[PDB]
Write an enzyme that holds these catalytic residues in place. Structure first.
Site, PDB file in Angstrom:
ATOM      1  N   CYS A   1       6.787  -0.901  -3.975  1.00 53.95           N
ATOM      2  CA  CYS A   1       5.617  -0.273  -4.670  1.00 53.95           C
ATOM      3  C   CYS A   1       4.359  -0.455  -3.826  1.00 53.95           C
ATOM      4  O   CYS A   1       4.014  -1.552  -3.372  1.00 53.95           O
ATOM      5  CB  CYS A   1       5.334  -0.776  -6.083  1.00 53.95           C
ATOM      6  SG  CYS A   1       3.739  -1.624  -6.226  1.00 53.95           S
TER       7      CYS A   1
ATOM      8  N   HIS B   1       8.641  -1.117   2.623  1.00 54.78           N
ATOM      9  CA  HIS B   1       7.570  -2.085   2.292  1.00 54.78           C
ATOM     10  C   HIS B   1       6.221  -1.458   2.657  1.00 54.78           C
ATOM     11  O   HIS B   1       6.070  -0.882   3.768  1.00 54.78           O
ATOM     12  CB  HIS B   1       7.767  -3.427   3.021  1.00 54.78           C
ATOM     13  CG  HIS B   1       6.993  -4.512   2.363  1.00 54.78           C
ATOM     14  ND1 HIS B   1       5.616  -4.440   2.202  1.00 54.78           N
ATOM     15  CD2 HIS B   1       7.388  -5.652   1.761  1.00 54.78           C
ATOM     16  CE1 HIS B   1       5.191  -5.506   1.558  1.00 54.78           C
ATOM     17  NE2 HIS B   1       6.262  -6.263   1.270  1.00 54.78           N
TER      18      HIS B   1
END
EC number: 3.4.19.12
Length: 259
Positions: free
Chosen positions: A29, A208
């Site tokens: 996220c 990431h």
């Protein structure tokens, strides 16, 4: 400590006690990557008392930040759509976002709706995953194809009757096997060169999202790692070597050392 709660490191930034959000999860996220950039730019303020923060809290802050952006040659009608488009894919930054990179330049990705949050907030998204120009073999093999696309094509390749497409099939397979930690040397150089000295950006690698910046002409990523929570002297970590040693720095970009 619990799963949609995050810890608030307070750190002396550009003169003032500034907050920053730490994650031990290291998920896919971008909320923190974006949110941290905002807190740093001081576009969002937390009361100094403040210790933990929810996703739902960050998410509110972000929505009001976006709806708060004053319009300014730019997109004219394309602006107002851009806001609505941001607003419509806004609740997906919580659950985290798949990115399909292009190997062709540090700024190229298959556009998705989520890209509108970044594009509107003036935050660049960059990645390090570039095909080197020293192997004309592979530049042509991968070509201008997207990643999720390359894998589709690699497979329809292993099965072709033309042997030349199984050559490209195996070349393209090779590059992904070799460049699998998703930053080439070439990537780093191009990306170093490319970021504006001083400006905050978001760096993608291995599903990431990180907060990046350029400083005295090298790259550094903000230290979201939660372990170094007590340590205010620990903020930036160099991105000088593609794979090697990091030197942690205080907010003023000088060397620091952990307890």
């Amino acid at each position: 400590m619990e799963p949609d709660f995050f810890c608030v490191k307070w750190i002396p930034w550009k003169g003032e006690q500034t907050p920053i959000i730490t994650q031990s999860t290291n998920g896919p996220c971008p909320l923190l990557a974006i949110m941290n950039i905002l807190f740093l730019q001081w576009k969002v303020k937390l009361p100094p008392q403040k210790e933990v923060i929810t996703s739902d809290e960050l998410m509110a802050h972000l929505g009001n930040c976006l709806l708060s952006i004053k319009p300014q040659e730019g997109l004219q009608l394309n602006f107002q759509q851009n806001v609505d488009d941001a607003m419509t894919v806004l609740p997906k930054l919580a659950t985290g976002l798949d990115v399909n990179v292009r190997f062709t330049g540090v700024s190229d990705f298959e556009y998705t709706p989520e890209c509108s949050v970044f594009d509107l907030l003036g935050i660049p998204l960059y990645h390090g995953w570039l095909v080197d120009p020293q192997s004309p073999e592979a530049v042509r093999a991968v070509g201008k194809l997207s990643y999720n696309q390359l894998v589709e094509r690699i497979i329809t390749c292993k099965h072709s009757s033309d042997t030349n497409l199984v050559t490209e099939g195996l070349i393209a397979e090779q590059f992904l096997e070799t460049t699998a930690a998703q930053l080439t040397y070439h990537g780093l150089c191009e990306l170093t060169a490319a970021a504006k000295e001083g400006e905050l950006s978001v760096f993608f690698r291995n599903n990431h999202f990180s907060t990046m910046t350029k400083h005295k002409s090298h790259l550094y990523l903000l230290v979201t790692d939660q372990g170094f929570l007590q340590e205010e002297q620990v903020v930036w970590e160099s991105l000088h070597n593609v794979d090697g040693d990091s030197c942690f720095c205080d907010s003023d970009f000088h060397l620091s050392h952990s307890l």
